[PDB]
Chain A
Amino acid sequence: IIGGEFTTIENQPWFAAIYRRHRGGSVTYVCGGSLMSPCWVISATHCFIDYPKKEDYIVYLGRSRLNSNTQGEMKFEVENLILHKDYSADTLAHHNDIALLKIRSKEGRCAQPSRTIQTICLPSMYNDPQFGTSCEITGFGKEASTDYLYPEQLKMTVVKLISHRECQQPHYYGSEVTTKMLCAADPQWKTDSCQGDSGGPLVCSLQGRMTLTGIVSWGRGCALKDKPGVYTRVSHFLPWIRSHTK
């Protein structure tokens, strides 16, 4: 995140951290995600595209730091990894960038409810906040586009939803942005999501609930002028989700 504040998981209890194991001894961070229900986490297909070996991913719930432990954290194994069929990327955008992970604990259980672990709510069929809405995004991603390391503490920031009309303008993203994506930016192009935040949530309130409205997906640079961050429009994938989380 560029800008933002540092937080703890008690402020984003639905955020999950996914890491990948390597032979040699290390586990490296991959992407962020969110918890929909006890056994299901949602993230972005591009996070798993280059290495779709579910056995090499670990999912942690209740985590405020990247490489050190938090008391209360739960560790999981990916039981089912579901990527999107019709996932494609171009020189920038990723289309149909949503994925589902079914988590299993080494004792055979799914997430359990604490003060650091909670589910986020889904939106209803193609229902979104109006452009203008301030939503917050969270994650362990870059702090500057030039950094080559991620922060150790969870960060968060507030961004506003912009319209398609403003985003598809030629001097922004043109037609790279489709109806199944959303754009979000800071009025003063000061904060944004960035490399390392992919898969994380974009949460806004809808009809009273804190709803997962978008998933961090792509963007040109970080906090650049007229280059909003682009998110998967979850309200338009509810059919898909449902088909697998039944």
Chain B
Amino acid sequence: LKFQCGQK
């Protein structure tokens, strides 16, 4: 629910 760099 917002960016989480690196997550697919």
Chain A interface residues toward B at CB < 8 A: 10-11, 13-14, 36-38, 111, 113, 118-122, 209-211
Q: Is the interface of B mostly helix, strand, loop or mixed?
A: loop
Residues in chain B near residue A36, CB distance under 8 A: 5
Contact call B5/A209, Cβ cutoff below 8 A: yes
Nearest CB on B from A242, distance (A) = 16
Question: Would you give 19 A-B contacts (Cβ < 8 Å), ordered by A?
Answer: A10-B8, A11-B8, A14-B5, A38-B3, A113-B3, A118-B3, A118-B4, A118-B6, A119-B3, A119-B4, A119-B5, A120-B5, A121-B5, A121-B6, A209-B5, A210-B5, A210-B6, A210-B8, A211-B6
Chain B interface residues toward A at CB < 8 A: 1-8
CA distance A14 to B6 in the complex (A): 8
Residues in chain B near residue A10, CB distance under 8 A: 8
Which chain B residue shows the least CB distance to A211?
B6
Given A119-B3, A210-B8: 11 more A-B contacts, CB < 8 Å: A14-B5, A37-B3, A38-B3, A118-B5, A118-B8, A119-B4, A119-B6, A120-B5, A120-B6, A121-B5, A209-B6
